[PDB]
Structures are given as C-alpha cells and as structure tokens.
Amino acid sequence: LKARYNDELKAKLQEELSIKNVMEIPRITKITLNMGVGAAATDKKLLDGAVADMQLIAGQKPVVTLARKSIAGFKIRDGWPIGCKVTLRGDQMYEFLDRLISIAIPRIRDFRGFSAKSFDGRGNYSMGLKEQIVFPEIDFDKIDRIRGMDITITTTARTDDEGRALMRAFGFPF
Amino acid sequence: GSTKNGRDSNPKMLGVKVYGGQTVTAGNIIVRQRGTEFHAGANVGMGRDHTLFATADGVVKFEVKGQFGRRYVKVET
Amino acid sequence: MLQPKRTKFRKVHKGRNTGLAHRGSTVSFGSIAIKATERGRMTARQIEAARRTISRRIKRGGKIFIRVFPDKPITEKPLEVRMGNGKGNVEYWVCEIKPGKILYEIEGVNEDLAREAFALAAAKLPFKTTIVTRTVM
Amino acid sequence: EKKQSRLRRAKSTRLHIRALGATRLCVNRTPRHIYAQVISADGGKVLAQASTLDASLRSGTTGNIEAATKVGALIAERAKAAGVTKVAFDRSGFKYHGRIKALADAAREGGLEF
Amino acid sequence: ANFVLNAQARAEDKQGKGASRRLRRESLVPAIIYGGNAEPVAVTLELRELVKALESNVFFEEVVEIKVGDKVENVKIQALQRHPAKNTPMHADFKRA
RNA sequence: CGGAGGAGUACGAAGGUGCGCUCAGCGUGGUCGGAAAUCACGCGUAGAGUAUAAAGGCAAAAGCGCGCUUAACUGCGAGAC
RNA sequence: GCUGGCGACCAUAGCAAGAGUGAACCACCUGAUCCCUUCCCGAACUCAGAAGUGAAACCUCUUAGCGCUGAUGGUAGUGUGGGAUUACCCAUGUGAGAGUAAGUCAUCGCCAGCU
C-alpha cells in the first residue's frame, strides 16, 4: 500500500465497485490493537510485561485502560487497570498493514484463519491473533509468558460487500 | 409493645416572599427554595443556599423562558 | 385469597369512598356481566366464594373474567387491648367498590344459565347488583 | 460533531458576557477566511463589523496570521470611529491562540481595551 | 327516513349543569351537533324517542335526520354518555353527514 | 405511645481558578474472557452520577479529567428572611 | 434571489421520508517544515496552502407518516344559603381531566458577501 495503494488500488476499487463519486471509494480509517491482562492485581507484573511487549511490537506508547464499575464475580473494580490498547492512523497504519501482510501471513500455522464472515455488519472487521509470539520480535527467552492480541480494522466501507472488496484489493487471504 | 416511629424535623418556612407586581429594593429576598425551582434573571442574584434576592430597586416579575421551560424571576427597573 | 405479591407500604390510611365509577363500567371481555349499583367494600374471601358459586353452576364451560382485585390492606387491633401504642396489624385485604363498577363477566355461556349463575352469586355479596349486556354505544 | 462541540464550548462564555452586560467582540475562524464583529449588550445591534472578504484584503491569502492582524487593525479602526472603548473578547469556542491571538493583539494595538 | 328525531333549540340560558339537571328531570336529553362548514348547534331530544332509536342496531351505522322547526340536519351518531349506574342516556354527539 | 427512614461525620483535596469531556442501557465481531472483564461501530434515550438518609434540584451541567495554587484571607457591610 | 454570522421565541416551531445547491460561501480534502496537541493516536486542537469533490455534512422545498396543538357540548369537583347524613339533593356563582370535531412542515430582527 502507501503510494501504490493511493495510485492504483483506489482506481481499481472505483472500477470494481462502480460508484459514481470518487469520494465513495472505501478508505481504511484506522486499526486498533487491544489486549487485556485480566486479574492484573494478583501479580502486578504481567501488566508491565504487556506494555513492554506492546511498545516493542508497535511504534506507539500504549495507554493503560482502567475498569468501569465493579463486578463481584471477578476481582476487578474501577480502581486498577485491566487492559491496554493503541490506535494507528496515517503512515503508521499504512506501514502496519504493509509489514503484516508481508511477513506475518507466510508464517501463520493455519492459513485462511481469517474468514470472509465475522464482519460487524457496518463494514468493520475484527480479528483475534493468538499469542504475542508470531510476529517479528524478541524470542521466547528474555520475555514474559505468552499473551493474546485483538486487531480491529475500521474503513469507510458502507457495508460488508464493500469491506470485503477492500480487503481483497489489499491482499487479505480471506 | 412500642412503635419505632415518632420523629420529625423542625419547620423551615420555605416559599415565595414577594409576588409579581410588588415593589422591591436592593437586597430584598424574593424566593426561599431548597432547589432551583425558580431561576434568577435580570437584576436577581443567587445565594449559596439557592435563595433568590434583588440586586436593584424595581418591580418583581415572573416568566417562563428557555428551551428547558425553566421558570425565571426578574426585577424591572 | 388473592393478595398483592409485593407492596411499597404495609399499612395505609382509612380514606373515604365517594363518587362514581366512570371507568370500568363497560363490558369489554364478554357478552354478559354483573355490575354493582351501591358503594361498599368487597373482600378476597367474598371474591373467591362468588367465583366458586358461578363456576360450579356454569359447569366450567366458559370463561369467567374477574375485574376486582383486593389491593387495599386493612388492620385490626389484637383484642383486650387499650387505645394507643401504634396502629394495628394487617389482617385481611379488600377492594373498594363504587356504584357502576363491574365485578364478573361471563363469556361463552348461554344467557339464561349465566343469568342464573349471577343470581346465585348475588346472594353472597353485601351490596345490590344488576346484570348488563354488551352494547354498541 | 465539531460545530456542536464548538457551540457548546462557547455557550458558557457567551452567557457570562450577557450577564455582565458588556459589549462583545465576536470572531469566527475558517480555513479560508476570518470574520470579526462588535455587538452591543442587547445583542440585536451590530456596532462594528469587519472581515477579510473586504476589497482591500481579498487579494491576499486571507487565511493566516497576517490576515488576522490586518482584520484586527481594521476592526479596531472601525470601532474607534464607532465610539466604543471597553469591550469583552469572545473566542466563540476557538482556542485563544494563533490567528485568534494575533487578531486580539491587533485589536489591542489599535486601541480597544480588553 | 327510518330515523327522524324531533328536537328543540337549546339556548344559552338552557346550558350548564343546573339547566341540564332540570332538563333531565323534565325527561329531556341535551345533545350537540358539529361538522364542517357550520358552527356547532345545541339541541334537546326526548328520552323515549332516543331510547327507541338506541334499541335498533342500524341506527349506529345509518344516517338520521334531526328536525327542529323547519330545519333538517342529516347526521350520524358519534358519542353517547350513559349514567354509570342506571345506564340511562345523558348526552349525545352528532357528526354532520 | 400516628406511618417510614437517617444524624452525633468525612475532605489540603472531595477547596479556588483556567481549560477540556459527557452517563447508563441495548444490537453486531473477535485470546485461555463467559450471564457478566477490556476494544470497534450502530440504535433508542437520562433510566448514570452527585462521600452519606430522603426531598427539592443539577447543560454555563451542581456530573467527569488535567495544570497552577491556598479566597478554607483580614477590617467591614446597604438591605432582607 | 442566495450564503454566512449575531439576535427575539422554544414542537402550530420537533422527529421520520423524498428532491435540489456550489458561480460566491460552507464542508470534506493535502502535509508534519515553523506555533500547538494527544493520560497512545495530526482521531480532536493548531498552522501552511488548494490539486479535486458535493460522496458525507450543512442549507432550502414537499409528504401530515409520526409527533404536537386543540374546540363546542356534556360530566367530575367546588365558594355562599337551605334540606339530608354513604356523602347526596335544591337556589346561585364557578368549572376541570380524559375523549371528540378540527388544526400544524413556524415566525420576526441586525450585519457582510455573490449573480
């Protein structure tokens, strides 16, 4: 993507979707990464490991997310943080979808894990990535136990067909 | 046996003191209210206990105004 | 005995019963109905007894609609007790009745049998009653 | 929405200015143009207007600090003729900085007291 | 044709709670007629005749003629107030047809 | 000696000011997280909250967050309840 | 005629659906060099300019589809005097709420710009 996107994929998306106005072409708006360390109060260090790993993987300082309300079933309440997230836009999001589609997909153990369905219905697509290994980063040594990842893609697509067209133009496996 | 009720507080004497069409001088209290039943308009001041008072000599007037339908009290000079 | 499942307050004031029942004086669930003509109080046991009397004679062949609910609690002092020392204890529930209030409607039964059932039921109630039929206006 | 947020931010300042009963120096910022107005206490009479759409400043860029300073000088010049001396500035929900700050400083240099 | 109800003009002095109760004691039912192109008209009808009309079912879905003097008003029954206890009619509304 | 509940405190911020932000609930997708954890969009709508019992109130929010600070000052006080 | 800003009212003024506008104005749009910003993000805030667009949003016109306004008559209540005492009747004054007919796609000020 980047210049190649702006130059060629916009044009073929217009041609494929047959939309009169140029502005109607779907555009990738942002990608959000979210990971929650449940019951962080118990050990009080998994959170530090998680923010370190997130800072390593993404070129942005993650923001620690506090809980809202108190739930008796769990040990969580409004006091201590329970998760962290980051939102990526601009050149950052472009190089991000880029190196992902470049390096991460050939190595995934099970291809086609991403599905044509699972779309939120408004044109936004959510994926869950297992383990904090499975990216280019530090090896298993010198890092804390494994952790999950959630990625959400929000575009300008007005619906699911437009969204799937945009992902196919980008090169998403399915 | 015995009842477990039987308590109440002393009276507070809340209510309106000056009605519409009355003449007031600066400082006169116009309304005593626990909440903001009435809102101050022109030449009317609000105290810490939500009491409304006159800040100028004139005549009292009541009205309904605003989007919320708030009742207002003002003084016309 | 019908009784509310829950209430905000255990004990209520005596009040006064005046006026007429402009609402609830129209037949809306059946063809024939029994309607009160003088005011009073109607208790839960009386409701149940009248319902039993009507159901027995109609032989459970039609629908009986009960439009009275005993929602008003009534208290009574123990007995051998002097005046004072707080309000009495709830003992039974009643329903206030104003003239024109409908009590029981019958659906799906012959008119003569329904009238006979209402005649049997009226002997159990503490106020005068009449019989009404559905009308267009 | 951006405009709704701006109005909700400016409402408090506008209401306080009305309660204080002071002449209001209102401004509006746009990527292309900037406008300034001087309104009396009642709010129904516009005492002195100014904008970058005037013939003198139209040929310029009209969307930068230089244009803001020119507009401030012009509005101060008109206000002096109008005869209003003491006024209260009103950012109208725009952060007091950059073009707004330059416009206000130009008005102060012109002579309006605020 | 089937339903022709006689009526009389009910002036202002005959309106209000006291006048209405006096009329009902005299066995008369007040009624109102309203509809497009004309102002409301207040009339008084006879209880026996109104009841006889009420027994008929078609009276509610057909047109009826109210005659007061030489004037004739063609209308349809719209509302009927009844005593909650005795069920006797007390008032009537008529929409001009 | 009628019906039904609270009080014998707390806070150098839970005060002042400047600036900024709106709750709660539902509908779709995703890790060991599901009736109920965190995240994205959409629907209707104050039912959220206000240290504490209830009432009257609360959009310039009186609800929520950050920076700087001590007006939680001294001497008074027209006029009112 | 048309756009923007500032005002008086706060649904007869609002919600929903349909149609149109960019010549000027409005918005989107370009970038992180200078000012400024994010408890992470040029998403907001701020700056430098204008390549294109009316897609989104704003604005205007139509539908009563909702929502809203709402008579007349009658009923309930009630001050004074009189008669009764399950809470009513008579004289006189006063008069709802609900429901019905019908109505409603607002209106009036100040400033600047264009064809």
Side-chain angles (χ1 to χ4, degrees), chain D residues 11-24:
Chain D
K11 190 39 145 313
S12 193
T13 300
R14 270 144 191 230
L15 296 151
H16 189 64
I17 276 148
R18 179 137 83 51
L20 274 35
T23 309
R24 189 171 30 110

Side-chain angles (χ1 to χ4, degrees), chain D residues 2-109:
Chain D
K2 297 169 54 161
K3 267 175 65 62
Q4 310 297 12
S5 305
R6 213 193 102 239
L7 277 274
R8 193 255 305 132
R9 285 199 300 274
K11 190 39 145 313
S12 193
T13 300
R14 270 144 191 230
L15 296 151
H16 189 64
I17 276 148
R18 179 137 83 51
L20 274 35
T23 309
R24 189 171 30 110
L25 178 33
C26 187
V27 296
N28 184 309
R29 189 181 49 109
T30 320
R32 290 287 296 274
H33 313 299
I34 198 173
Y35 313 92
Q37 283 203 344
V38 165
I39 307 141
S40 53
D42 54 277
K45 308 168 193 307
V46 176
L47 301 192
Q49 56 76 57
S51 62
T52 182
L53 294 197
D54 289 57
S56 311
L57 309 324
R58 192 142 200 177
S59 312
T61 53
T62 64
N64 56 26
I65 316 190
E66 173 61 271
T69 52
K70 295 167 171 177
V71 161
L74 199 45
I75 192 73
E77 165 155 54
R78 263 161 226 161
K80 281 214 151 177
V84 61
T85 55
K86 290 186 169 189
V87 86
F89 189 75
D90 162 69
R91 33 183 195 108
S92 309
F94 287 110
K95 176 179 185 294
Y96 175 96
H97 182 245
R99 263 153 91 190
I100 309 302
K101 187 175 168 183
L103 164 48
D105 253 324
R108 264 184 268 266
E109 215 355 280

Side-chain angles (χ1 to χ4, degrees), chain A residues 31-49:
Chain A
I31 320 95
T32 194
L33 305 317
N34 161 30
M35 72 320 305
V37 279
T42 57
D43 69 62
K44 330 150 298 293
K45 288 174 73 183
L46 70 186
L47 209 184
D48 157 69

Side-chain angles (χ1 to χ4, degrees), chain C residues 2 11 14 22 26 36 61 69 74 90 98 101 127 134:
Chain C
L2 288 122
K11 310 171 179 196
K14 205 213 308 311
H22 297 267
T26 316
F69 197 85
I74 303 292
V90 175
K98 284 172 201 247
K101 173 72 159 198
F127 39 81
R134 179 185 299 291

Side-chain angles (χ1 to χ4, degrees), chain A residues 9-138:
Chain A
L9 297 299
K10 299 260 294 310
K12 255 82 79 200
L13 216 168
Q14 151 60 293
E15 261 44 56
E16 208 268 68
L17 243 181
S18 308
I19 37 69
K20 286 70 187 171
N21 263 123
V22 47
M23 311 279 336
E24 298 171 318
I25 69 91
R27 179 169 11 111
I28 181 64
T29 53
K30 54 52 175 172
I31 320 95
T32 194
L33 305 317
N34 161 30
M35 72 320 305
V37 279
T42 57
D43 69 62
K44 330 150 298 293
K45 288 174 73 183
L46 70 186
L47 209 184
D48 157 69
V51 35
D53 305 330
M54 257 33 60
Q55 170 49 48
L56 160 62
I57 66 189
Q60 277 187 8
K61 233 301 172 183
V63 63
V64 200
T65 286
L66 286 305
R68 290 167 343 162
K69 214 203 302 175
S70 179
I71 295 164
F74 305 105
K75 297 191 178 181
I76 76 176
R77 64 283 156 278
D78 38 42
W80 269 53
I82 83 185
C84 319
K85 64 145 210 154
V86 281
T87 173
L88 291 45
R89 312 193 164 100
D91 296 344
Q92 199 75 15
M93 56 136 286
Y94 273 114
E95 275 65 64
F96 175 86
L97 216 31
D98 268 357
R99 76 305 182 251
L100 151 69
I101 295 178
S102 178
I103 198 136
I105 196 159
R107 197 280 320 130
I108 68 189
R109 301 295 85 246
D110 167 321
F111 294 73
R112 186 224 30 71
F114 322 97
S115 64
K117 335 288 163 103
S118 85
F119 270 65
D120 70 340
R122 308 292 189 173
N124 318 315
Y125 166 78
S126 69
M127 88 187 33
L129 197 129
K130 319 306 73 179
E131 302 175 70
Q132 89 202 1
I133 176 56
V134 318
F135 293 115
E137 81 301 40
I138 312 312

